[PDB]
Amino acid sequence: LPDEEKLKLLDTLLTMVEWVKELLEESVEKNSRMRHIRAVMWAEYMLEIARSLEDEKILEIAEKLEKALPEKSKMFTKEEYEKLMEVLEELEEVLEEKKEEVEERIEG
Amino acid sequence: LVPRGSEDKWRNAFDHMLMEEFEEKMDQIEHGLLMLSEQYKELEKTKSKELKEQILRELTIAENYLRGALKFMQQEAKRTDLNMFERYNFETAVSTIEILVKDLAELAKKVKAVKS
Numbered sequence: 773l774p775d776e777e778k779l780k781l782l783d784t785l786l787t788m789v790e791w792v793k794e795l796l797e798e799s800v801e802k803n804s805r806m807r808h809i810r811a812v813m814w815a816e817y818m819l820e821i822a823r824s825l826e827d828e829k830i831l832e833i834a835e836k837l838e839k840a841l842p843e844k845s846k847m848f849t850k851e852e853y854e855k856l857m858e859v860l861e862e863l864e865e866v867l868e869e870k871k872e873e874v875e876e877r878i879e880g
Numbered sequence: 881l882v883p884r885g886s887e888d889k890w891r892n893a894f895d896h897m898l899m900e901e902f903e904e905k906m907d908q909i910e911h912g913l914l915m916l917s918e919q920y921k922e923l924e925k926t927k928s929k930e931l932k933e934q935i936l937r938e939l940t941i942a943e944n945y946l947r948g949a950l951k952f953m954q955q956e957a958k959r960t961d962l963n964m965f966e967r968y969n970f971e972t973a974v975s976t977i978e979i980l981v982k983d984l985a986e987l988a989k990k991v992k993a994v995k996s
Contacts, residue, residue, distance in 0.1 A: 805910055807903070809979060845983075
């Protein structure tokens with residue numbers, strides 16, 4: 773991927789991170805298993821997009837996120853939800869850093 | 881390039897209201913699934929025929945709603961007027977309908993297995 777398409781993918785990823793955080797919050801508030809499932813699916817889609825960047829730290833945090841996701845239809849426990857939000861903030865940090873680094877790269 | 885947009889991307893009050901009502905109906909149906917699982921335990925215990933037929937009736941009602949919702953959601957995911965948020969929303973709705981339908985079908989099988 774050229775740095776420009778990397779930047780486009782990074783913008784998409786950063787937006788979906790906030791979307792997934794919002795869906796996790798809504799699923800915890802409504803206490804519904806279907807909302808949990810929806811949020812986990814959104815997370816899986818985000819992971820599938822994130823893996824295409826072939827960035828090592830991004831892949832590492834994606835693996836952490838996959839570890840923080842519940843199995844299939846199972847809801848996430850409280851500590852698991854907190855761990856999920858933690859890994860999501862970490863992914864947001866590295867995605868923002870990579871966006872900054874790519875924007876620096878395009879400038880010359 | 882591809883419409884990445886910002887982070888507030890519903891874009892339509894009609895579709896948003898429809899999706900919200902659909903999500904509430906899905907919550908109700910999943911809760912009914914849990915209740916019917918408890919009642920299926922009761923039916924394994926008792927083998928009451930009336931309870932069998934009643935559970936089957938509620939399962940059928942839920943399954944019919946879910947089949948209609950599934951068809952609608954797949955059509956809506958086959959729209960070309962779609963953005964990223966809407967596309968993922970429709971795909972997730974379809975997938976969750978698949979899951980709930982399969983759970984309902986398995987419970988229907990388990991409940992049909994009893995002699996009654």
